Amino acid sequence: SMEMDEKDFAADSWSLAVDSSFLQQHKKEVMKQQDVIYELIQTELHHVRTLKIMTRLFRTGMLEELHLEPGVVQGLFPCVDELSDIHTRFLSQLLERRRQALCPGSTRNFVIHRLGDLLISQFSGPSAEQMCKTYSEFCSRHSKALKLYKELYARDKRFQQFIRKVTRPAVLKRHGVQECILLVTQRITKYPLLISRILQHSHGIEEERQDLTTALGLVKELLSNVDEGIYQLEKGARLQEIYNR
Amino acid sequence: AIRKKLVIVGDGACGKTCLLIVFSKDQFPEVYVPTVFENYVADIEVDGKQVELALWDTAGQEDYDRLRPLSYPDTDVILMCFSIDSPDSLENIPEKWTPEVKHFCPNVPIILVGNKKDLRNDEHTRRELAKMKQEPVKPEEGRDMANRIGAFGYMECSAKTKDGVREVFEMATRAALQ
Numbered sequence: 001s002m003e004m005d006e007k008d009f010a011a012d013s014w015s016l017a018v019d020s021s022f023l024q025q026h027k028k029e030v031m032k033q034q035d036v037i038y039e040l041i042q043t044e045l046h047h048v049r050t051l052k053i054m055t056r057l058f059r060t061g062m063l064e065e066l067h068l069e070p071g072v073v074q075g076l077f078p079c080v081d082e083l084s085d086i087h088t089r090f091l092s093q094l095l096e097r098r099r100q101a102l103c104p105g106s107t108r109n110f111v112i113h114r115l116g117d118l119l120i121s122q123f124s125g126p127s128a129e130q131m132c133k134t135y136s137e138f139c140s141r142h143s144k145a146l147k148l149y150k151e152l153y154a155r156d157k158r159f160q161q162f163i164r165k166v167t168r169p170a171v172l173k174r175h176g177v178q179e180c181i182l183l184v185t186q187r188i189t190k191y192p193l194l195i196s197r198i199l200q201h202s203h204g205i206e207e208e209r210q211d212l213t214t215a216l217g218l219v220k221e222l223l224s225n226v227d228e229g230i231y232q233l234e235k236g237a238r239l240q241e242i243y244n245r
Numbered sequence: 246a247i248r249k250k251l252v253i254v255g256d257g258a259c260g261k262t263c264l265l266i267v268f269s270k271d272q273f274p275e276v277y278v279p280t281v282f283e284n285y286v287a288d289i290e291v292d293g294k295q296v297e298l299a300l301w302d303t304a305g306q307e308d309y310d311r312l313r314p315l316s317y318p319d320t321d322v323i324l325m326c327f328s329i330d331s332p333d334s335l336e337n338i339p340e341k342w343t344p345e346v347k348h349f350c351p352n353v354p355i356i357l358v359g360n361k362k363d364l365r366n367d368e369h370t371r372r373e374l375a376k377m378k379q380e381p382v383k384p385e386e387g388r389d390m391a392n393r394i395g396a397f398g399y400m401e402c403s404a405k406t407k408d409g410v411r412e413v414f415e416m417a418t419r420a421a422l423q
């Protein structure tokens with residue numbers, strides 16, 4: 001992540017991120033809504049950062065330092081460039097909505113009143129089709145990636161030294177290779193939980209309540225399609241084992 | 246330190262997310278209780294042994310039968326949760342959660358955990374449950390379910406007051422080490 005965004009999302013909540021004199025000007029219901037919107041953006045910023053650790057620290061580091069057989073790095077990090085493009089673009093839209101809402105003279109005081117339309121756009125049309133195709137591919141390659149990682153760590157000395165080196169810093173404690181893969185798989189199922197709680201506090205404007213209800217429905221349709229499109233790939237699996245599923 | 250992995254499973258209203266949040270922060274948040282839990286790696290020292298215990302939640306995966314099992318690879322200990330204010334969450338333990346965990350995590354110890362124990366003597370909870378001819382889960386009902394499903398053990402906690410929370414994770418670390 002970049003320092004400007006990390007500082008804007010360093011606080012545990014929206015109520016602690018804004019100035020107390022600004023917080024005091026809002027009703028409790030607005031504060032509850034803003035705290036959940038802030039958590040959605042903060043966790044999206046962290047999710048994009050997990051994808052950057054996968055692409056820049058692990059993937060590119062292996063290509064530039066190690067002598068792995070072709071197709072091995074892609075097997076460890078399936079779809080990471082596509083996933084990074086989807087979420088970096090989504091994160092850009094969320095952060096621009098916050099930036100437009102800032103009060104003049106402030107870099108921290110804002111209220112986002114219209115999130116629903118942005119979520120409907122993300123979870124409909126071509127961007128939803130790309131999310132569905134990419135997560136169906138990623139989640140079907142998840143078990144294979146973990147097994148390839150374990151095999152390489154147990155048998156390749158230079159691979160083990162590389163992993164221990166780049167995961168040594170305290171800031172990588174939660175972000176080893178296997179931890180990154182499960183963090184990405186689990187991201188998509190966090191969206192309905194966050195959207196439902198934002199909706200619970202967005203009844204004040206009927207257009208907003210309707211837009212968040214539509215967005216929640218689109219996210220659930222996407223998840224159902226992804227879930228129905230998954231079948232774990234296994235290295236060396238035989239056709240007979242596949243057609244006898 | 247040796248690395249171990251913990252996964253918590255249970256119905257949507259069982260309190261698993263709150264339990265992970267309270268343990269990982271060592272506090273019931275005073276300003277904002279997070280909606281979700283990403284992951285955490287706890288440094289735990291139990292009975293003289295140092296362990297890095299990676300913590301994972303299955304919240305949000307309850308309706309997705311092909312995504313949910315992706316949380317299980319290489320799990321060392323399972324916390325199987327139910328809420329004491331929800332006798333319905335306990336009924337789904339033996340024939341939904343237990344066969345799934347035994348299939349994907351063979352030979353992994355399961356600790357059955359009764360969450361929200363503070364609601365057992367809460368008048369509002371007793372009134373709401375009495376309308377459906379129900380009462381908060383009794384301690385013997387939790388122990389009998391744990392015995393029946395082949396659990397490593399039975400424990401209770403309250404994320405709200407923090408009571409019993411440290412003990413659950415220290416025992417989970419001992420189970421993962423065996």
Ligand SMILES: Cc1nccn1-c1cccnc1
Nearest residue numbers: 015016020023028031275276
């Ligand atoms: C006083 C305060 N500072 C940050 C948040 N809050 C707050 C406001 C209302 C209820 N609870 C906490």
Ligand SMILES: Cc1nccn1-c1cccnc1
Nearest residue numbers: 143232314315317318319349
């Ligand atoms: C490989 C594995 N270990 C535990 C569970 N799984 C698994 C199997 C099939 C689909 N998803 C996850």
Ligand SMILES: Cc1nccn1-c1cccnc1
Nearest residue numbers: 310311313314344345348349
């Ligand atoms: C195959 C499967 N997917 C999700 C859960 N299960 C399951 C359920 C019961 C027993 N064994 C596996």
